């Protein structure tokens, strides 16, 4: 054991089926007559049925309430693996050559990566549609 300590944060995407509640007469709505858009003829003549509905909150208070309830199924794998900083930071290398190759021999990384467009693009575009990569997520260690 070295002198280190290593906490590992882990995002988990739980799925939720929220409860809902409301008052009696609560909101009132008003529905428009269904006007149809007669799109130009082309044998397979698609049409666009359309409507507009207004809503108003008749209740003076918060007639509705909502809260988290029950988990149907986690989508996160709930696995654990270290972040691949050699892939997270492809450009970094030891200034020595044989030392860096010996490090790759133990890390299991192949060879340093070529320039990627995501690096130059995120260099000027700070990430928040990039918030949802929809890839697998894993532990991220902290000294």
């Amino acid at each position: 054991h070295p002198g280190f300590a290593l906490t590992a944060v882990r995002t988990d995407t739980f799925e939720v089926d929220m409860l809902l509640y409301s008052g009696k007469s609560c909101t009132s709505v008003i529905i428009n007559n269904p006007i149809v858009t007669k799109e130009e003829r082309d044998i397979s003549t698609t049409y666009h049925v359309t409507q507009n509905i207004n809503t108003v909150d008749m209740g003076l208070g918060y007639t509705s309430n909502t809260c988290v309830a029950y988990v149907n199924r986690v989508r996160t794998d709930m696995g654990v693996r270290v972040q691949d900083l050699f892939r997270v930071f492809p450009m970094n290398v030891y200034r020595h050559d044989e030392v860096d190759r010996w490090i790759r021999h133990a890390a299991g990384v192949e060879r340093p990566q070529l320039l990627d467009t995501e690096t130059i693009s995120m260099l000027t575009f700070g990430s928040m549609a990039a918030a949802t990569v929809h890839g697998q997520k894993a532990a991220c260690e902290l000294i």
Partner: peptide, 12 residues
């Protein structure tokens, strides 16, 4: 019903 199926017919 929000609208009867008969009501769409004149629009066609």
């Amino acid at each position: 019903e929000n609208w009867s199926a008969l009501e769409l017919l004149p629009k066609v």
